[PDB]
Every structure is written in C-alpha cells, then in structure tokens.
C-alpha cells in the first residue's frame with residue numbers, strides 16, 4: 528500500500544476491485560430509499576418486501592487487505608521462515 | 624339471470640356500506656371497493672393513466688390505489704419491512720438480550 532493516501536490497498540488491488548462490479552453494496556437501504564419513499568421499483572426493495580434479505584460478511588474489505596499487506600511484507604523480510612515459526616531477517620539479494 | 628365482472632374495470636354498483644374516513648401513518652386494514660389489505664398509507668406522488676383503480680407489481684403485490692372519494696392516488700407498504708436479529712448469551716448464562 529502507498530502511504531500517500533490511507534487507502535489500505537495496493538495499486539493492483541484497486542484496479543481489481545474497480546474491474547468487477549457488485550449487485551448492491553452497503554446493505555444500508557432505508558425508507559425513502561424504498562417504496563416507502565420514491566423509487567422505480569428496484570429489485571432490492573422488492574426482495575425485502577417478501578422476506579428476502581442479504582447479510583453482510585463478517586470481515587470487511589479493509590481487514591482482508593491487511594492480511595495481504597502482512598503476507599507480502601513478511602516475504603520481503605524473511606522469505607518463508609516466518610511460516611514455519613518466528614521471523615528470520617535476511618537480505619533480499621541473498622534470499623533470492 | 625344476473626351476470627357481472629369483478630375487479631377489472633371501475634365499478635358502478637356497490638353494496639350498502641359506509642365510509643370511515645382516512646387514517647394516515649398507521650398500518651391498518653383497508654377496504655377500497657372490495658380490496659382487503661394491510662399496510663401503512665402516508666402519501667403518494669405516482670402519476671398514472673385514467674381508468675385505473677389498482678396499482679400492480681411484477682410480483683402481483685399491490686402498492687398503490689386510487690381513492691374513489693378524494694380522487695387521489697395512495698401508497699401501500701407492509702407494516703414490517705426490515706430484518707431483526709437478537710443476540711443472547713444462553714439460557715443458563717442470563718436473560719438479557
């Protein structure tokens with residue numbers, strides 16, 4: 528990740544997220560956002576009118592990217608020794 | 624021999640029943656020209672065409688209706704919309720949720 532902006536994601540991950548779209552993110556739709564207010568009869572509000580609901584995942588997007596950031600950073604500092612135990616510092620030139 | 628059609632066109636012959644005005648912001652049991660239902664009715668801004676008495680949907684669920692006395696469209700929304708979840712620590716543990 529780039530420390531210039533606290534996005535908690537790398538350059539490639541942003542492109543990956545923006546390349547593929549999602550049906551309806553957020554799960555924060557209230558009255559006024561459904562037929563209690565005004566809509567064109569969106570599919571999401573029709574689903575909720577018949578007991579159909581979608582639950583959010585336990586892990587957020589930011590938390591998932593933290594694991595990837597830790598995994599990538601660990602490789603550049605220890606290689607694969609940290610996977611079998613404690614981390615072992617080593618120059619990257621000698622590691623490669 | 625008497626023949627009649629039901630719930631396809633605006634009606635001209637109705638039974639001997641009296642109206643009980645209009646209630647707002649409450650989910651109640653309404654009856655509009657023989658259309659029993661349940662839900663909240665606050666206001667409507669939908670625009671439609673004449674010769675219409677009911678508002679249909681892709682799932683055949685009523686959402687709008689025209690008041691025959693005030694000649695204005697209303698809205699129907701079920702009394703329960705959102706989902707509710709309850710977290711409990713166990714029966715032996717406690718009863719607070």
Ligand SMILES: *[C@@H]1O[C@H](CO)[C@@H](O[C@@H]2O[C@H](CO)[C@@H](O[C@@H]3O[C@H](CO)[C@@H](O)[C@H](O)[C@@H]3O)[C@H](O)[C@H]2NC(C)=O)[C@H](O)[C@H]1NC(C)=O
Pocket residue numbers: 692693
């Ligand atoms: C029965 O249905 C008739 C139509 O067939 C409706 O006639 C309407 O009667 C209402 C009674 O409130 C009239 O509204 C009144 O109009 C003026 C506005 O300046 C004023 O006197 C009152 O403030 C009130 O708003 C309405 O004009 C009239 N429509 C017409 C004449 O075209 C009527 O709603 C139904 N009768 C009832 C509810 O007793």
Ligand SMILES: *[C@@H]1O[C@H](CO)[C@@H](O)[C@H](O)[C@H]1NC(C)=O
Pocket residue numbers: 715
């Ligand atoms: C609840 O508490 C009682 C108290 O003795 C215990 O015996 C029982 O096994 C507990 N019930 C369950 C379902 O764990």
